[PDB]
């Protein structure tokens, strides 16, 4: 069902290596809906190539637009399994510290702070 269950570790590593070769300025991001989530919709895809200069505040705005949310729908994003300490950090810096061993950056979204 989840990305890590659909693709082998070998397959995920090789896909991150191809993104380095073909899209060298992009961060490879996996974005999934929390398995408990009732309110927010699912995304149209799983794997996102994010320009490495955007900060987390802008990435939250990008994902809200992609989900076509309105102003009073709540949205919380986990990175590497946990809350973001700051939304001001450039995603290139977030990637270097929070990347998975497969080389993806894993994010999960919910309408409650309680995942
Ligand atoms: Cl690129």
- The Cα 27–Cα 23 span in angstroms is 9
* Closest of 75, 90, 88, 82 to residue 106, by C-alpha: 82
In angstroms, what is the span from residue 73 Cα to ligand 1's centroid?
Answer: 33
In angstroms, what is the span from residue 113 Cα to ligand 1's centroid?
Answer: 33
Distances, alpha carbon 22 to alpha carbons 26, 58, 79, 104, 109, in Å: 9, 24, 24, 15, 28
User: How many domains does the chain divide into?
Assistant: 1
In angstroms, what is the span from residue 49 Cα to ligand 1's centroid?
Answer: 9
The DSSP code for 43 is: P
In angstroms, what is the span from residue 38 Cα to ligand 1's centroid?
Answer: 35
- The Cα 59–Cα 89 span in angstroms is 11
In angstroms, what is the span from residue 99 Cα to ligand 1's centroid?
Answer: 18
Q: Judge whether 9 and 102 are in contact, CB under 8 Å.
A: yes
Question: Where in the sequence is the domain holding 72, given as residue range(s)?
Answer: 1-115
Reading phi first (left if > 0) and then psi (alpha if -120 to 50, else beta), residue 49 is in beta
- The Cα 82–Cα 98 span in angstroms is 10
* Closest of 115, 111, 100 to residue 4, by C-alpha: 100
């Amino acid at each position: 069902k989840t990305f890590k269950q659909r693709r082998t570790f070998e397959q995920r590593v090789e896909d991150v290596r191809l993104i380095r070769e073909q899209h060298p300025t992009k961060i490879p991001v996996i974005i999934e809906r929390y398995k408990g989530e009732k309110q927010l919709p699912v995304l149209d895809k799983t794997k996102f190539l994010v320009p490495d200069h955007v900060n987390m505040s802008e990435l939250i705005k990008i994902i809200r637009r992609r989900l076509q949310l309105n102003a009073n729908q709540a949205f919380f994003l986990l990175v590497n399994g946990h809350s973001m300490v700051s939304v001001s950090t450039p995603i290139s810096e977030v990637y270097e510290s929070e990347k998975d061993e497969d080389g993806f950056l894993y994010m999960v979204y919910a309408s409650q702070e309680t995942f």
